[PDB]
Design a protein around this ligand. Structure first.
Ligand SMILES: CC(C)(O)c1cc(F)c2c(c1)C(=O)N(Cc1ccc(Cl)cn1)[C@@]2(OCC1(CO)CC1)c1ccc(Cl)cc1
Length: 92
């Protein structure tokens, strides 16, 4: 565990462009737990194939709405606090 369970289980309200992202992979609500936000972001990453076999822990999000929301061209899936911070930038 990198992120406490209690923080994972908290209800959050995505800002509009993060909501657009979640809705594009079937999410149907205005509020989600952080763990659910992460699940749908994962579904989005795998759908858009924002990954590469040469560097299997890196999300390659340049030239993608996800990159614009997170403010980076790529990031490591191992860096959970950094990911949470990037998601907090995108919550109401
Ligand atoms: C191939 C690659 C690059 O290694 C890869 C892509 C990917 F999409 C995910 C992982 C790995 C991974 O371990 N995940 C889980 C995770 C990681 C970090 C945090 Cl803080 C929370 N959860 C990702 O989601 C995995 C799902 C949904 O649980 C099945 C689709 C995931 C979710 C969300 C984000 Cl923002 C980033 C990665």
């Amino acid at each position: 565990s990198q992120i406490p369970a209690s923080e994972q289980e908290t209800l959050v309200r995505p800002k509009p462009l993060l909501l657009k992202l979640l809705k594009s992979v079937g999410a149907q609500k205005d509020t989600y737990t952080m763990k659910e936000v992460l699940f749908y972001l994962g579904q989005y990453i795998m759908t858009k194939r924002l990954y590469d076999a040469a560097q299997q822990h890196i999300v390659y999000c340049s030239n993608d709405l996800l990159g614009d929301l997170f403010g980076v061209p790529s990031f490591s899936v191992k860096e959970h606090r950094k990911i949470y911070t990037m998601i907090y930038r995108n919550l109401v």
